[PDB]
């Protein structure tokens, strides 16, 4: 009889009141002390328990964050690489960094920001960029980046 595998067969994903964004906030600050701009989307998002942040999260903060869910007598979750409670994966509460252009968390790239898929939006950023107080060589480099989408 496989006692550990049984845990996964009897397990049910948490509800809205369990393993929620509250634990994302808690583990984030815990993980930070073991080594942040906390924020409070016009489309459907699957996972709602992600604490959103306005700064980068180092590999150390992120690795410590995942270890906090470590739990013995459990199999290694092949998604996050942590032995954690079944159906309670820390990837669902990992804190996410927002893009200041759209206020949503996504990866850096050419076709990842929702705010750079419409020419009307790119122009609005070009006008805003003209009012920047940043060094000229950065405003120049950023202005070109916008034009490269047109």
């Amino acid at each position: 009889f496989d006692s550990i595998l049984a845990k996964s067969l009897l397990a049910t994903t948490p509800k809205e009141d369990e393993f929620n964004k509250t634990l994302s906030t808690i583990n984030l600050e815990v993980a930070n002390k073991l080594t942040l701009i906390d924020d409070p989307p016009p489309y459907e998002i699957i996972e709602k328990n992600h604490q959103l942040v306005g700064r980068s999260l180092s590999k150390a903060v992120l690795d410590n964050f995942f270890l906090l869910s470590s739990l013995s007598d459990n199999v290694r979750c092949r998604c996050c690489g942590i032995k954690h409670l079944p159906a309670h994966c820390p990837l669902s509460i990992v804190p996410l960094e927002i893009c200041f252009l759209c206020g949503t968390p996504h990866f850096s790239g050419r076709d990842t920001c929702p705010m750079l898929r419409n020419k009307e939006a790119i122009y609005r950023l070009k006008d805003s960029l003209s009012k920047s107080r940043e060094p000229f060589h950065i405003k120049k480099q950023a202005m070109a980046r916008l034009n490269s989408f047109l």
Binding site: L5, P14, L101, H106, F107, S108, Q141
Partner: protein
């Protein structure tokens, strides 16, 4: 809201920078998480579609992990955002092993008829085709 005349240019460059295998540690949004999922090859499988949208839409990870642990040989690159996956070689054999263990579990557990039905319902897999859809 978060844009000001002191970070708008930096935000445009920071948010649009593309990934470079030659220089992978270049500061980029959620880089630590992107590298963690790249190492696990979750960006090249049945979730690659999602790596260009909101990270809160990558997948229902609570379920992806629950499925991945029920099928040790199921390639993780097969899991889909909702928990579905492309049937793997040892799929038919694992459902068999899962039922035996499940029944043995119910025996040792002092459950109630309504609760016994749920546990059996939780592990049902509808194989519509190339893809296997659980629950």
């Amino acid at each position: 809201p978060f844009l000001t005349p002191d970070n708008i240019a930096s935000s445009i460059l920071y948010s649009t920078a593309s990934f470079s295998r030659s220089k992978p540690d270049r500061p980029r949004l959620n880089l630590s998480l992107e590298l963690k999922l790249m190492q696990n090859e979750l960006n090249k499988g049945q979730l690659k579609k999602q790596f260009k949208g909101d990270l809160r839409n990558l997948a229902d990870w609570n379920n992806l992990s629950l499925v991945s642990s029920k099928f040790p040989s199921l390639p993780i690159t097969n899991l889909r955002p909702d928990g579905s996956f492309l049937k793997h070689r040892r799929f038919n054999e694992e459902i068999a092993y899962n039922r035996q263990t499940l029944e043995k579990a119910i025996k040792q557990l002092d459950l109630s008829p309504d609760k016994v039905i749920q546990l059996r319902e939780q592990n049902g897999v509808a194989v519509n085709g190339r893809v296997c859809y659980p629950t």
